[PDB]
Design goal:
The structure is a homotrimer. Chain A is α+β, with helices and mostly antiparallel strands and 112 residues long. The first copy, chain A, has a single domain, classed as Alpha-Beta Plaits (2-Layer Sandwich). Chain A contains two helices and seven strands. Chain A has a four-stranded antiparallel β-sheet, with helices on one face. In chain A, strand 3 and strand 4 form a beta hairpin. At the A-C interface, strand 1, strand 2, helix 2 and strand 6 of A face helix 1, strand 2 and strand 5 of C. The structure holds adenosine-5'-triphosphate (ATP) (3 copies), chloride ion and magnesium ion (2 copies).
Chain lengths: 112, 112, 115
């Protein structure tokens, strides 16, 4: 099993959620985060008026899935989160050694 | 060492925190998140107009512990977070390769 | 690749961000979190009833970098986040098996800059 952690634009997140649900990926945890990327470099200026590059709001999605589903999930998120402009985000694939379902105590892919 | 990431009901979280503390697991990081599970399937209705399944508030607990403490901490969270209804949450066990204590630079199980 | 997850004081986060940026680490994801550590033990004093130890606001920084950058980034965070009091934070190094750039679909060696 792997944890897929994707940082996506808030405007794209509804489309990412719907693309996952259509393919039966219902379990997901979402956090409001802020981030920056390469765009902007060290500093910006406008006016002005020189400023740090701003940490701007993004949506973090975490979805833990079976190893065989990882590339399907990655593509569903990429196709739905993409816009073509800097700031579209990244997806990190993190190993998960086990999962426990709190309601029943079930572990393993069973737990997903 | 392992990172234990548990998504639990907000109403149960204070019981989880107290169960951990009673056994001397004091360090922990908590985030307000939103999530859905399998309950609801692809969509719901009510007096609609069908509606998406709502992402609802949950609490994310992250606790990094030595490997020999993982099973104990999983039991403390399962017992304290349980209600028996869908939405009780899941626990993910994620490998950690190292830990550093910022105050002193100490690494390894020592840093915990 | 590794995910470096650091929990630091909010007062020090601007210095951490500046330290990273000065060395060219620009990609980062930050979350407001709350935490406690060992300080306070099982309960606090006042008044005159006991109170639980409070979960207080912190800043969580996640930065994913190539393996050859991990020690550099750790030192940049420790040296900018340090104050010398309990509550300074911890850094967790977590394996990452792959990274995908959404804009381009690149992965692996092409998904993070070489620093
Ligand atoms: N190395 C990283 N570690 C942690 N989070 C990152 C990293 N890189 C990007 N992110 C997150 O992804 C969000 C969008 O980053 P992205 O890489 O799309 O922007 P960019 O570098 O400006 O774009 P591009 O590479 O297309 O020019 C960031 O605001 C941050 O939340
Ligand atoms: N595969 C997953 N990946 C990430 N987060 C998940 C996943 N499954 C559940 N969660 C998180 O756990 C919370 C509770 O999910 P839970 O699994 O308890 O719900 P359910 O599937 O409806 O019920 P149950 O598993 O008892 O049948 C979710 O709202 C979400 O935050
Ligand atoms: N084992 C842990 N797992 C997850 N988060 C932790 C853990 N230990 C500390 N943290 C996070 O780091 C923050 C600061 O904790 P820190 O360890 O610096 O405090 P302390 O234990 O009181 O101090 P000291 O270690 O210097 O005595 C916590 O509030 C929490 O957010
Ligand atoms: Cl993680
Ligand atoms: Mg980038
Ligand atoms: Mg479930």
């Amino acid at each position: 099993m792997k944890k897929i952690e994707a940082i996506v634009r808030a405007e794209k997140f509804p489309e990412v959620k719907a693309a996952l649900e259509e393919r039966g990926f219902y379990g997901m945890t979402v956090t409001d985060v802020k981030g920056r990327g390469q765009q902007g470099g060290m500093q910006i200026q406008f006016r002005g008026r020189t400023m740090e590059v701003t940490l701007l709001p993004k949506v973090k999605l975490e979805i833990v899935v079976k190893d065989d589903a990882v590339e399907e999930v990655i593509g569903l998120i990429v196709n739905s989160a993409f816009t073509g402009s800097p700031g579209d985000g990244k997806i990190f694939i993190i190993p998960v050694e086990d999962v426990v379902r709190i309601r029943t105590g079930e572990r393993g892919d069973d737990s997903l």
